[model samples]
Target: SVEVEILLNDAESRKRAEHKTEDGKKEKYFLFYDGETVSGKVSLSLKNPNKRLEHQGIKIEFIGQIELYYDRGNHHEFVSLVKDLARPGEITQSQAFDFEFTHVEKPYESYTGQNVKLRYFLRATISRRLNDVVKEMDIVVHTLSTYPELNSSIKMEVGIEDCLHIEFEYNKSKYHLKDVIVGKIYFLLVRIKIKHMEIDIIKRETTGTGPNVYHENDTIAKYEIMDGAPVRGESIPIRLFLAGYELTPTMRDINKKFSVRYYLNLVLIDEEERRYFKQQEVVLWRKG
Candidate 1:
C-alpha cells in the first residue's frame, strides 16, 4: 500500500500546525487568504516495510472550486495548478517534495453551506497505467471585505404613489454573521391603513451568466416589528439577530461562476390585503 501525506506551513512561522475541527479533532486544514503564499510538503511512503513502490509519475495540484452535493456531476474550478514531481520513479524509502504557490489570488472565501461547498484543496496523484494512488488535502480560505468599504449607512425611500411613504436607515452596510441589524423605519406620510409590518432576511442565489443564468431566492426568516397601521411621524425600531437563523456569508461574483447574496426585505400589508415590499442589499461576513 502507498501512503500520501500533506504538510502545510504557516506564512509567517513557516511551521506545520493542526486545525481543530467542529468535533474537537485536530486535522490538516491549512488556513489561507488572498494574495498570500502557500507553501507545503507532500510526502509519499510505502506501507510494507520490505516492499518498494513503483509509479509512472507523481504530480501535485492546487485547485479552488465550487461543488454542490446534490449536483455531483457539475463543478466549477476557479484556480488550478499542476506541478510535476517525478517521472517513472521507484521509491524504496519515504519520499517527500515541497511545493509553493506564491501570492495566490483567491477570489472567494471558503464556505461549506447547506447544499453547496466552495473550497480550495491540494491534490497529489501517483500515476500508474492502471489504478493511480490519489490523495487530497483541503484548505480553508477567508476572503474578508474588499469592496464598498464598511462605514457608510444604508438608506432607502419607499412609497406607494401617495398611498404610503416611508424611509429607512441602518447603522452600516456590512455585518458579521452573528451581528445585530439595528435600524429604524420612519413613516413620512400615511394614507393606506396598514395591517402589519415585518422584516425578512432573504438569500438570493444567482447561478451562471448571460442568458443561461438562473436565480433563486429563499426567505430564511421573517419577524414582525410593527402591528397595525401607524400615524404620520411614527418610527419603528428594527433589531434582528443574524445568529437565530442559518445564514451564509454574502458572496459577490464568486469565481465568476455564481453568487449568494443577502438582502433585508421590508414588507407591509394593508387592509385590503395588498402587500408592499422594499429590498436592500446587505453584505454579510464572518468574524475572525
Candidate 2:
C-alpha cells in the first residue's frame, strides 16, 4: 500500500481556529473563512524506498463540494482549482509538491448533517496507467455571519375558520446554537376539542440546482407544551433549550449548492386524532 498525506502549513496556528464537534471528541475542520488563503503540501511515500513507482501524471485539487450520502457518485463542486505536479513522473523514494490557493472564495460553510455533507478538501492523485491512487484531506470552513438587520421578534397568527385562532410570538427571530428559545403561544379562540399541543424543531435541507433539486426534512426535537384544550385568552409559555440537541447552523443558499435551515413547527392534535400544524422559520448561528 502507498502512503500519502496532506500537510497544511502552520497547522498549529490553524488549529486554534478549528471547530470541534458537540462532544468535543472530534475536530470538524481547520477553520478558514471566505477570501482566505489555503496553502499546503502533498507528500507521497512507500514502505520500500528501493521500489520504483510509475504514473501517468500527478495532480492536486482544492475543491468545495456538496455530497448527498444517499445519492452516491454525484458530487457537486462549486469551487474547483487543479494544479498539475508532474507529467509521466517516476518516483524511487518519495515526492512532495507545494500547493496554494489564494483568495479562495469559499461561499459556504462546511456542514455534516443527517443525509447531506457540504465540505471542502485538498485532494492529491497519482494517475497511474492501471489505477489512480487518491488521497483526500477534509478542510473545515466557517462562514462568518455579517448579522443582517434581523427582527428582534417573530410574530404570527394561525387559525381555522371559526374553529381555532392562535397567535405565537418568539423573543427573537434568530438564535445561537446554545441559546434558549423563549416564546409564548396564545389562544384567541378555541372551538374544537384539542387533545394536546406540541412543538417540533425541524431541519430542512435543500440541495442541487434547477430541475435536479432535492429536499429533505429532519425532525430534531419534539416536546409537548400543553396537555389539553385551552380557553380563549390563554397563554402557554415556551422555553426550549437548544444546547442538548445536535443542530447545524442555518445556511442560506450556500455556494448556490445547498442550504440548511431550522424551523419551529407547532402542532395541535384534536380529540379525533386530527393534526393541524404551523411552521415558522428561525435562524440558527454560532456565538463568538
In model 1, the number of clashes is 0
Per-prediction TM-score to the true structure, in the order listed: 0.74, 0.80
Could you report the Cα RMSD, in angstroms, for every candidate shown? Answer: 4.9, 3.9
Cα lDDT of model 1 by residue, 124-229, tens digit: 9999878999999888777665344556668877777977788888887888887898888899988989898888989988766434666778898998878888
Each prediction's number of clashing residue pairs? 0, 0
State the lDDT of candidate 2 residue by residue for 159-214, as single tens digits: 88898898888888888888898889899989999889888999998877445878
Over 4 Å off in model 1, which ranges?
10-29, 66-76, 111-117, 146-154, 161-163, 173-180, 188-193, 209-211, 228-233, 240-255, 271-273, 283-288
lDDT of all predictions: 0.79, 0.82
Poorest stretch of ten by lDDT in candidate 1: 15-24
Best by the lDDT measure: 2
